[PDB]
Design a binder for this molecule. Structure first.
Ligand code: BTI
Ligand code: BTI
Lengths: 687, 236
């Protein structure tokens, strides 16, 4: 088969010129017209770093070298956590690669660089249309000397549901083979059985196991008894007994006050004198720099930081602030400030390309109300964008109050992905329906809760500390199936060879083990990603402005496909609509006229919504959210029981089962499969 | 300067202590340390404020800083621990970057310690929410149009908060906006050429006008000092 990469790229550029951005843009901001300036890099291999120790001496040798290091070690979140929080994890492989050689040379003493796991795996395929594995491989070639770190969920890997154990093990194996070094293993509820599986999978792969305790509450507040200092110490003892190489405290919201830092970290150090202590926080409160200095003074060996232009607010504390504040003390990081400035200047320019995703569109600074609401950095940005998309943007203060009430109703569980989303969906549901906590708990048998809340209460994410809230769980679930113990333990092993064969039959002989694991964790996303890249080619070759907005008429630019293969492209014109509903886009490619036929849905777009449900008529079932009808479970003339499934709506990437509020006969169904509904659109009538 | 840096001899701890003795002898009711740029590191805070407290046990000590470096909250906590009686803060939505440290951050970090401010956090939130809405009316003047966060290069350039915003707007009005990095470097060179004087209004503007003049004319420090009889310097 002849490769057609240049034509596929021109087809993408022509598609963006006719139809607009293929990635959903949350705010009316434009990318910077200027590409970021890459700082000068020395000619040669980078200096030896902590990865050379890990490769020579293994995970235990690496952990001893970290503990024995004189001074404070840093870990860079800019590659993943910093943007996940600020630009919603939209940062592309293109921009990461440009600065990677500078990082390798000037930051060779970093403990690790966090660059992959969390939301980056799904987001790369779903929204950036790039392979997360290729990003890992190409960054590993460019940065040979710094350990790569990922955020791993213990029994779910990087996915949103539980997987069979053999998928989690095979994911950690293939991640290590592809150059992942450190696995930060956490659970969204600190549910030890999920963490132990992820630790065993990462350790069996030959990775550095970093067991991460998610922090919530306040250990310095004697009134907060559920998540006390004793809770954290007891969980640390179980994770150390399970053979963690490094112990992490993951403060996903920025709740660690300097006094709580001092108390928790000194207690851990006194208990575990030889174990490396890694502290992660967010600067959401504007106190994260002070919190990390207090951790370092209390005997933390490593702290998470971001590049200064990618730090603060819902991100990590500033790298330059920590380096400057520790300078000339026993905690000196030995990082030259000039190198931090050049790194920050690149990221300031690069962040300008992502203005369309920047959390500063909605939040101008850190906010201390995080000590009340306990909303994690990445959840705050997402919950605001969701509230605005649902017409609740003016009520976001009510949504934050309802988030506290929803956390309590759910039982004050730790709030990190996906538990932070479950609390968020419940909070939006309460505000949308005008419900207080007491009304939502009283009516729990009558209300149709968000799917994420139902699946949590069923046990699909593990068991929360202190157990599930009763009688609230029993009222919501009724007769719905309950998962006891670890949800992955009852799943049959996935046949990865059968899946590989299915993928080869669908996509041809170029299927890799990484493709099989991507399909195993994210089947619909991976299928869409392969179909999209089959149509549009290697979009990672485009600069971020051209990827998001396409070229302007008469704009000229270069695209490097491979070393020594540059495309000189100029956009010339877009035609009027032809009789086939297509526009012809004209380009110059390497001094030659090209034309591509594209499709303008915007040019010809119209629709009509009949349906309305009277709020006072119990038999009229309205759509509980804007969404697409996936499935219709009933027909006209069918008898239905109270709580019986009627239809399935798919909105905001969540199947919601619409259930009957009464017993009766379905008089009429007003909806069809694949129909798009607005809120309160009449689904069906019951008599 | 930096009192914790033994290489910076001009503005040493002894300079600050000697000036404090003259101002106390002159009958000051309160002694203020005005860090107009956000240069006070937590170690320098501890050293300066403890030395002042040990010398003047009965005198109120007031510490003012800017959060330009992103370390201003940590600097004010270090001053308070070293025996400062008062610190400057701003409402949270009006804090950080070239402004003062966050009020809500200081109130939260001192809560339940001997340094508790007794300010209820809910009242700080309501105050910040008003100012978040009010700041939206001034979007046409907001420093975030040009500076998205604090910047640690302030430890090198020593540009005060209000001068940074003004110097950027002036550089953009003169067509030097793309050269603002050269203007910041020339600000260090201009400070040295002028003799490393304290930089606050109007001295911070004088250094700024010289820095813009040097960049506009393509002059290094050595060329500007050599040609000082031939050049028409800014009036300031
Ligand atoms: O639009 C759909 C969701 C896109 C991913 C959101 C990520 S999942 C990791 C992190 N935790 C959350 O609760 N949200 C973000
Ligand atoms: O446009 C003309 C100047 C407007 C006032 C600028 C003020 S004066 C106080 C402060 N210090 C400076 O150097 N600039 C500002």
């Amino acid at each position: 088969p002849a490769q057609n990469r240049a034509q596929k790229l021109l087809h993408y550029l022509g598609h963006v010129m006719v139809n607009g951005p293929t990635t959903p843009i949350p705010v009316k901001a434009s990318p910077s017209p200027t590409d970021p300036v890459v700082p000068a890099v020395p000619i040669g291999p980078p200096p030896a770093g902590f990865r050379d120790i890990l490769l020579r001496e293994g995970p235990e040798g690496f952990a001893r070298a970290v503990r024995n290091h004189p001074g404070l070690l840093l870990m860079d979140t800019t590659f993943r956590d910093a943007h996940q929080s600020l630009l919603a994890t939209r940062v592309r492989t293109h921009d990461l690669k440009k600065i990677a050689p500078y990082v390798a040379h000037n930051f060779s003493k970093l403990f690790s660089m966090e660059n992959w796991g969390g939301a980056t795996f799904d987001v790369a395929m779903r929204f950036l249309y790039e392979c997360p594995w290729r990003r890992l491989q190409e960054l590993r070639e460019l940065i040979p000397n710094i350990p790569f770190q990922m955020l791993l969920r213990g029994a779910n890997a990087v996915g949103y549901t539980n997987y069979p154990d053999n998928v989690v093990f095979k994911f950690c194996e293939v991640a290590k083979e592809n150059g992942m070094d450190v696995f930060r293993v956490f659970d969204s509820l600190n549910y030890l059985p999920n963490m132990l599986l992820g630790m065993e999978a990462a350790g069996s792969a030959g990775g550095v196991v970093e067991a991460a305790i998610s922090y919530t509450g306040d250990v310095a507040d004697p009134s907060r008894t559920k998540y006390s200092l004793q809770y954290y110490m007891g969980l640390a003892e179980e994770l150390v007994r399970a053979g963690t190489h490094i112990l992490c405290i993951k403060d996903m919201a920025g709740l660690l006050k300097p006094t709580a830092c001092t108390m928790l970290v000194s207690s851990l150090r006194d208990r575990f004198p030889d174990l490396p202590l890694h502290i992660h926080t967010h600067d959401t409160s504007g106190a994260g720099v002070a919190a990390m200095l207090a951790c370092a003074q209390a005997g933390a060996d490593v702290v998470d930081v971001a590049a200064d232009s990618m730090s603060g607010m819902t991100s990590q504390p500033s790298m330059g602030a920590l380096v400057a504040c520790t300078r000339g003390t026993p905690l000196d990081t030995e990082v030259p400030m000039e190198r931090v400035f050049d790194y920050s200047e690149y990221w300031e320019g690069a962040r300008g390309l992502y203005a369309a995703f920047d959390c500063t569109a909605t939040m101008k600074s850190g906010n201390s109300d995080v000590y009340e609401n306990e909303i994690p950095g990445g959840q705050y940005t997402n919950l605001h964008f969701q509230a605005h998309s649902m017409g609740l943007g003016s009520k976001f203060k009510e949504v934050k109050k309802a988030y506290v009430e929803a956390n309590q109703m759910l039982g004050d569980l730790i709030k990190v992905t996906p538990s932070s989303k479950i609390v968020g969906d419940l909070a939006q549901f309460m505000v949308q329906n005008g419900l207080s906590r007491a009304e939502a708990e009283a009516q729990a048998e009558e209300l149709s809760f968000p799917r994420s809340v139902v699946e949590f209460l069923q046990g699909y994410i593990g068991v929360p500390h202190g157990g599930f809230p009763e009688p609230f769980r029993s009222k919501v679930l009724k007769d719905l199936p309950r998962v006891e113990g670890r949800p992955g333990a009852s799943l049959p092993p996935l046949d990865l060879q059968a899946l590989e064969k299915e993928l080869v039959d669908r996509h041809g002989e170029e299927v890799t083990p990484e493709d099989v694991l991507s399909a195993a964790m994210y089947p619909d996303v991976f299928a869409h990603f392969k179909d999209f890249t089959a149509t549009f080619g290697p979009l990672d070759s485009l600069n971020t402005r051209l990827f998001l907005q396409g070229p302007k008429i008469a704009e000229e630019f270069e695209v490097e496909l491979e070393r020594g293969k540059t495309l000189h492209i100029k956009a010339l014109a877009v035609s009027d609509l032809n009789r086939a509903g297509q526009r012809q886009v004209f380009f110059e490619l390497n001094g030659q006229l090209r034309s591509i036929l594209v499709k303008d849905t915007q040019a010809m777009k119209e629709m009509h919504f009949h349906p309305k449900a009277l709020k006072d008529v119990k038999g009229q079932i309205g759509a509980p959210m804007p969404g697409k009808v996936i499935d219709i479970k009933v027909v006209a003339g069918a008898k239905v029981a109270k709580g019986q499934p009627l239809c399935v709506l798919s909105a905001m990437k969540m199947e919601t089962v619409v259930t009957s509020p009464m017993e009766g006969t379905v008089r009429k169904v007003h909806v069809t499969k694949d129909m798009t509904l607005e809120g309160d659109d009449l689904i069906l009538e019951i008599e």
